[PDB]
Amino acid sequence: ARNVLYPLYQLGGPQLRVFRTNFFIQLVRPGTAQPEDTVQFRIPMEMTRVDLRNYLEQIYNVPVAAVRTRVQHGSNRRRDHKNVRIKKPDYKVAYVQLAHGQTFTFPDLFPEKSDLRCPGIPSWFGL
Amino acid sequence: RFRPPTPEPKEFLEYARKAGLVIPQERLERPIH
Amino acid sequence: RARGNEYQPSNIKRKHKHGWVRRLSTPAGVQVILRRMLKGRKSLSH
Amino acid sequence: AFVRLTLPPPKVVDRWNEKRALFGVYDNIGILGNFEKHPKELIKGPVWLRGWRGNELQRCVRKKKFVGNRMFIEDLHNLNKRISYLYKHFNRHGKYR
Amino acid sequence: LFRRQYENSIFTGSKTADPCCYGHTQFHLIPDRLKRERLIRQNQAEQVEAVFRANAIASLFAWTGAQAMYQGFWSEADVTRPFVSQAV
Amino acid sequence: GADRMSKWTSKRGPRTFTKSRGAKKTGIYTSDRKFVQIKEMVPEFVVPDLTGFKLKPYVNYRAPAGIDTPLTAKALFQETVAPAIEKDFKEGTFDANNLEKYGFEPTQEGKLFQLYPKNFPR
Amino acid sequence: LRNRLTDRYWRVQEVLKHAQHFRGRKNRCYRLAVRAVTRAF
Amino acid sequence: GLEEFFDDPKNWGEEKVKSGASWTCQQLRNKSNEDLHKLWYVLLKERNMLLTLEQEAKRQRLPMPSPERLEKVVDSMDNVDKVVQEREDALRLLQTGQEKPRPGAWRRDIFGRIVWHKFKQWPIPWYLNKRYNRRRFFAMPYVDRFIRLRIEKHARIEARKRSLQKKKEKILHAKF
Amino acid sequence: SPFYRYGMSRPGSIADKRKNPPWSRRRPVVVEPISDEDWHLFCGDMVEILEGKDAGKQGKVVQVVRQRNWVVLEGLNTHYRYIGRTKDHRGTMIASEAPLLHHQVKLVDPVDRKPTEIQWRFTEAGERVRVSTRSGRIIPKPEFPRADGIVPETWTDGPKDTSVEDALERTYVPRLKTLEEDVMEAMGIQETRRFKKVYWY
RNA sequence: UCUCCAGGCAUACGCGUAUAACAACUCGGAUAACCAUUGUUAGUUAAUCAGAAUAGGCAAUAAUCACACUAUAAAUUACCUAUAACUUCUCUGUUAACCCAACACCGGAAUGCCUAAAGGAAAGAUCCAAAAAGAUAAAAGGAACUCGGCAAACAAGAACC
RNA sequence: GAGCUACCUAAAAACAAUUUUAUGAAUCAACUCGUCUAUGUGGCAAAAUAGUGAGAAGAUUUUUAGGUAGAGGUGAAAAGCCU
RNA sequence: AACUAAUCCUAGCCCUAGCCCUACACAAAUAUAAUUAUACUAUUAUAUAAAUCAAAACAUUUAUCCUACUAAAAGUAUUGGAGAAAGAAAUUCGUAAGGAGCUAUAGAACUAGUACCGCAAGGGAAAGAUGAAAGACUAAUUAAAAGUAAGAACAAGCAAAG
Ligand SMILES: [Mg+2]
Ligand SMILES: [Mg+2]
Ligand SMILES: [Mg+2]
Ligand SMILES: [Mg+2]
Ligand SMILES: [Mg+2]
Ligand SMILES: [Mg+2]
Ligand SMILES: [Mg+2]
Ligand SMILES: [Mg+2]
Ligand SMILES: [Mg+2]
Ligand SMILES: [Mg+2]
Ligand SMILES: [Mg+2]
Ligand SMILES: [Mg+2]
Ligand SMILES: [Mg+2]
Ligand SMILES: [Mg+2]
Ligand SMILES: [Mg+2]
Ligand SMILES: [Mg+2]
Ligand SMILES: [Mg+2]
Ligand SMILES: [Mg+2]
Ligand SMILES: [Mg+2]
Ligand SMILES: [Mg+2]
Ligand SMILES: [Mg+2]
Ligand SMILES: [Mg+2]
Ligand SMILES: [Mg+2]
Ligand SMILES: [Mg+2]
Ligand SMILES: [Mg+2]
Ligand SMILES: [Mg+2]
Ligand SMILES: [Mg+2]
Ligand SMILES: [Mg+2]
Ligand SMILES: [Mg+2]
Ligand SMILES: [Mg+2]
Ligand SMILES: [Mg+2]
C-alpha cells in the first residue's frame, strides 16, 4: 500500500500484513518485442518487484518466475500557453516472466473492422 | 534583449486536423428537435 | 583567451554552495530564504 | 491621433437622489444650534485631516502624528522618506529666498 | 544480458607460450544463489537442470574455442580437428 | 545554467548520488555490503475467498439509496455497549472497575492492532 | 491619467490641410509638415 | 490468471458496455467488515481491468468504450475506504479519545510559522538521536521583522478582497 | 477559472474546450445572483414566454444553465441553422432553441393555463413546495428523464451488477473490533508476536 | 554503386527526452530535401557493470619487471585477544546526434583502447570581370626592396656586441 | 560570490620514440604555452583562424573535492587576479 | 474600391473609513546534496547603526531617519564651529461605508514574483476585447498614423510662395 505508514519492525516483530491494497496496476502491450513468456505491467512507483510477485500470485493466482523493473522518465519539454513546462508523470515498468512454461500474448482488443447540365439554378422550380 | 516566441494560438478543425486528435463522440444531453 | 564559459557545471558543488542545507547553516543564510519566501519565489534555493 | 468610432453610452445623473437633494443640511448647526457643535465636526475623512488643512509637507507630518504608530513597515518607510524629500525641497530649493 | 566495452581476451587458462595447451576436464561449483532450494522457492523448479546445462555450454564452448585459436584456427580458417573437452 | 525548478531525483547528479522513489525498505545492509531481506518486513496481501460472493462491482439503478448518517461514537456506543450496561444496571451487577467486561480496553499496549499510535497499514 | 488631451486629432488636421499640396513627407508628417507650412505662411 | 485484466471476450470491440450504479456510502454501511474486505478486491479487479483498457485505447488512438465505468469504480472504492475509516475513527475515540490516528504536535519552525508536526517512528528516544536534534523547532529574534511583514502582507490582500466585493455589488445594483 | 464563460454546450465537451480555452479572457457576464431557495423553475415545468418572438406561447423546459439564469424551452425562441455541414454536403436545416432568462418567463398553473407567479412554502409533512401567489395551489415537481439516459424502471441488470435484494441485505453487526481484527479471526490467521517499543517523535 | 576526406568507439562529468515510430508542414534549422520543429504513441530490464556489530592489543625495513643497483625529494583495511549474531536480493543509475560558450558557434572539454574493420563530404545552379584573400611556377639579375631580409626561399649554415 | 582566476590542502592521473647519461640534459610527438607575420575586425571567436614558433621526467601538465572574501583574500609585484 | 493597422470596457488596482487576531486546511514526504519510512555527525540573532547629504569646502554640528495623544502656550524659553541649524516644558483644550481616485504605456511589478536574465544574493516582463445565443460557422465598425499599393521618372536647385 502507498501513502500509508508501515509499522517500524524490530527483531522478533510480527509479520507485516496489508488487508486492503492501495496498489492498482495495468497490463500494457509491449513497445519492443518480448519473449512470449514475458508480460509488461505499469505499476505505482512505490511498488517493489517483490510486491508485484505476491500481488499477482495471491490476487490473480498467476505463477511468476522472475520480475524486472525500471523507472521511465516522463517528458518535461512541452510548454503551456504561458510558456510553463508541462510534466508527464514518471512511471515504473515491470517485466514479468511467467512460470511453468506458461505463455501469454496481449489480446487484440478493439477487433472492430445536381445536374451538370443546369448548374446554379435551383431544381425545386418546375417552371 | 528580446520578446518571447508565443505561438499565439473554422480554426479548431485545422488545429486538430494537423495535430490529429481523438474526438470521442458525445451524447447530446438535450435531444435535437 | 575566449571568455564566457566561466560556468563548469557540477551538481555536488552546486548543492554544497547554494543548497537548502547550506543556506540554513548560518543565520544570514536563513534570512536569504526569508526574503525569498516573502517575495513569493517559487525556488527558495537550488 | 485616433478617436472613438462610436458614441460612448449615455451618462445619466439623477439630480434628486437623497445625497444630492439633502446636500448642505446641518451646515449652520452652530449658529442655528447655539454652538453646541462646530460644522467641522460634520466632516468625514482621514483622522489626521478633519477640520484641518496644510501643504504636502504639513500633511505628511500630521498623518505620522495621528496614525504613525499603527502604520505598516513599508508605508512608514515611504512616509518617512517623503517627509525628508519635502523638507529638503521647501527649505533649500526654489526661486525665492 | 547487458553490453559493455572492455578488453577482448582469448585465454585457455595459460598463455600461448605454455606447453600445456589442451584441456582435459573442468570442475564447476554452482553458487548458492542458484542452488536447488532457492530455485524451487522462486517457482522456477523446471530451471534446476537448466542451470547446469547453461554453465556447461558456455564454460566448455569458451574453453574448447580458446584452445582452437591457440592452434591458429579462427572463423576464416575453420578447425580441421574437432576440439574436445568435458566438465562436471 | 542548472535547472532550479525540476525535482531532484536519483537520475540526476553523479553516480554517488542515489535516493529512493518512495518504495518501503524490506531489509538491512550489513557490513561488507550484504543485503539481508527480512521476511516480516515484506508486506503480505491478505486476500479472501470470493467463491459464492453475491456482490459485484456495480449496483441496480432500481436500488434505493439511503439517507447518509455518518457513524458517531455515540451511535457506536449505543448500538454495542448500551444494551449490556442497561441490563446489568437493572441486575445491579455493575461497577466502574469492570468496564473491561463490556469491551473497554484501558491501554492499547500488547494488542497486535493498536488504535493509537496506529501500528498497522490500511 | 486623470486628464488627457482629447482634441489632438483636430490640432493635427489644422496644420496638415495647409501641407497636402507639398511633395514628400512634408505633406503627411506633422513634425516636418509644421515647419514647411510656416515657411509658406 | 491474466485473463482477469481484460473484459469479457464478447464485449471486446463493442461500442458501449452497460454498467450499473456505483455503491453509495449508506448501502455500504449495512455490510459487515468481512464483506467489505471481499468487496474491496472485487472492485480492485474491475479497476485494474478498466485502467488496462484505458491505456490500450490510447495506444490504438481510439475512444475508450463507456468511460463512465471507471468513474463509478473509483467512487465506490472511495466510499468503501470512507466507511471503514469511520468505523475505526469511532472505535479509536471510544477507547482512546484521540482525534487523529498519528501522533503530532503544534510547533514553530525556524522561519517563525506555526506548523503541525507529524511524528515519526524511531527505535531510540529523542534525547539520544543526533539526526533529530539538528532539526530546530524555534525561531531566533531576527525573524520578528519577517513575522510582521507577513501579517501586513496578508492584511493588504484581505482589504483588497473586501473592497472588490463592495464594488461588484454596486455594479449589480446599478444593472439590477 | 474566473474567465470561463458558461454556454449552451455542456461543460467539458469538445465545443466547450474550444469556446473556453485556457487563454481566453472575455469580459464577464453580469448575472443577477439568485438564491438556491429563490430559484423556482425546473426541467419539465411548462412556462410562458412573456416577451419576444414567441411571446405568449407556452413551452416545456428541457435545460437549465443556472450560472447564466437560463431556462431553455423545447421548440421555442428558435432560429435556424445547418447541422452536420460537410465539404460535400450542405447539412440538414433544423430549428435551434436559444436561452431565455428567468425574468422573461413565468410558470403556468396546471388546471387553468395562465402565467401564475408562485411562492415557496412548506407543507404538512414539511416538504418544501411551490405555491401560486394567486389561486393558491400546489404545483407538483415534474419528472424529467435522467441526463445520463438511464431509466431505472426499464433497467435490467446484466453481469457484474449486484441484484437489488443483495445490495440491501444487512450483514453489519456492531462490535468494538476493527476491520483488521474481524478478517483475521474469520480467515483464521494467527499471530502471537508483538511489535517492540517504538518512540514516536 | 562511384569519387574523395581521415579521431573514432567507450566511460567519467554534465545535460534531461533532443531518443524511436507515426502523423503533420504553422513556428524552429539561418534555404530546400528531410527533419533536430509541432502533436500522438512508445522506450533505458542487472546478486557479476554502477551506486548506498562492540571493545582491546601492536606495527623500524618504499617504489621503479624488484633481483642485482645505488640513490634522495624518504614515499600505503591487515594480524591477533574476547564479546555478539547463527542463511540474504530489496532499492537506485542504464535512451540520444547530448555538455560549457546568447546559436545546429572553425572555440573549450578528463581517461582507456585503438588509427580506419570505426566515422565522414570541401561544390544550391552558372559564370570565369576588376579589387581583395590563398596556393604553385619564374627568363636575366640576386636585398638593388625596406624603418628593418618583414614575408617568402632549390636557404635554415658562421661569427660578433 | 574562489564551478573563472590567484594561491593552497587532500585523493588521484599522463609523458611514445631517440641520444645522453644518471639530468629543473639533448632532438622531437601527445600535451602545455603563445614568439613573429598574415587573415579577421558586428568576425567561426565580446581575443579566433591559418601558418610559424617555446617547453615537453619536471619549479611539468591535467582531473576531482575542499579552503582563504572586499577596511579583505591571493600575488616567482604585472598595483596581476578575485565569474 | 486596401494592405499594414485603428476603434473598445472591465480584469483589477488606489486612498480612506471601520475592525485586534484565533486561515495554521486531505493521506504521505521533507532540514539527509530539503521534500529520500529507522540510530551514524547532535542543536543557538545582535555590543552604540554608518555614510550620503546640509554648512555653498571641511574637521564639532546637520529636522525626519532614531514614534509616544490633539489645539494652544511657540518657533517662545533654551541649545549651537552662538554658524548652518536645532527646539521644549509648566499650563489650558478635547464625548466623534465612501470617492470633482485610475480604466490596459494608467491603476499594484503582477494574466506573474511567472517567463526570462544571473553561479548566487538578486533583477524582472509583455499581453485581453463578437453576440442574447457559436447546440446561431466567432463577429462588426474606420477618406482615418507613420509604412506601402493603386500610379517610377522627365533641364533648374531648403522644394515653397507670387
Ligand atoms: Mg535496475
Ligand atoms: Mg556568463
Ligand atoms: Mg574547471
Ligand atoms: Mg529522431
Ligand atoms: Mg516525416
Ligand atoms: Mg519529434
Ligand atoms: Mg559494484
Ligand atoms: Mg548509451
Ligand atoms: Mg552563426
Ligand atoms: Mg566508414
Ligand atoms: Mg558541402
Ligand atoms: Mg562552386
Ligand atoms: Mg614558390
Ligand atoms: Mg626568377
Ligand atoms: Mg631605396
Ligand atoms: Mg642598414
Ligand atoms: Mg622570416
Ligand atoms: Mg577551485
Ligand atoms: Mg619519453
Ligand atoms: Mg629538457
Ligand atoms: Mg623546441
Ligand atoms: Mg630547449
Ligand atoms: Mg604564479
Ligand atoms: Mg613594478
Ligand atoms: Mg569581473
Ligand atoms: Mg558640505
Ligand atoms: Mg561628520
Ligand atoms: Mg500595467
Ligand atoms: Mg507593469
Ligand atoms: Mg496612410
Ligand atoms: Mg524651378
From Swiss-Prot, chain A:
It is found in: Mitochondrion. Its main location: mitochondrion. One of its GO terms (cellular component) is mitochondrion. Keywords: Mitochondrion, Ribonucleoprotein, Ribosomal protein. The keyword Ribosomal protein applies. The gene is Mrpl23. This is Large ribosomal subunit protein uL23m. GO terms for molecular function: structural constituent of ribosome. One of its GO terms (biological process) is mitochondrial translation.
UniProtKB/Swiss-Prot annotation, chain B:
It is found in: Mitochondrion. The chain holds residues 40 to 77 of 306 of the full protein. This is Large ribosomal subunit protein mL45. Component of the mitochondrial large ribosomal subunit (mt-LSU). Within the mitochondrial ribosomes, required to direct the nascent polypeptide toward the tunnel exit and position the exit at a distance from the membrane surface. Component of the mitochondrial ribosome large subunit (39S) which comprises a 16S rRNA and about 50 distinct proteins. Belongs to the mitochondrion-specific ribosomal protein mL45 family. It comes from Mus musculus (Mouse). It comes from the Eukaryota.
Swiss-Prot record, chain G:
GO terms for molecular function: rRNA binding; structural constituent of ribosome. Keywords: Mitochondrion, Ribonucleoprotein, Ribosomal protein, Transit peptide. The keyword Acyltransferase does not apply. It is found in: Mitochondrion. Disulfide bonds: none annotated. GO terms for biological process: mitochondrial translation; translation. GO terms for cellular component: mitochondrial inner membrane; mitochondrial large ribosomal subunit; mitochondrial ribosome; mitochondrion. Transmembrane segments: none annotated. Belongs to the bacterial ribosomal protein bL20 family. Component of the mitochondrial ribosome large subunit (39S) which comprises a 16S rRNA and about 50 distinct proteins. Interacts with OXA1L. This is Large ribosomal subunit protein bL20m. It comes from Mus musculus. The gene is Mrpl20. The chain holds residues 10 to 50 of 149 of the full protein.
Swiss-Prot record, chain I:
Belongs to the universal ribosomal protein uL24 family. This is Large ribosomal subunit protein uL24m. GO terms for biological process: mitochondrial translation. It comes from Mus musculus (Mouse). It is found in: Mitochondrion. SUPFAM superfamilies: Translation proteins SH3-like domain. Component of the mitochondrial ribosome large subunit (39S) which comprises a 16S rRNA and about 50 distinct proteins. Keywords: Mitochondrion, Phosphoprotein, Ribonucleoprotein, Ribosomal protein, Transit peptide. One of its GO terms (molecular function) is RNA binding. Pfam families: KOW (PF00467), ribosomal_L24 (PF17136). InterPro entries: KOW (IPR005824), Rib_uL2_dom2 (IPR014722), Ribosomal_uL24 (IPR003256), Ribosomal_uL24_CS (IPR005825), Ribosomal_uL24_KOW (IPR041988), Translation_prot_SH3-like_sf (IPR008991). GO terms for cellular component: mitochondrial inner membrane; mitochondrial large ribosomal subunit; mitochondrion. SMART domains: KOW (SM00739). The modification Phosphoserine is found at S9. Coiled coil: none annotated. Residues 41-74 form the KOW domain. PANTHER family: MITOCHONDRIAL RIBOSOMAL PROTEIN L24.
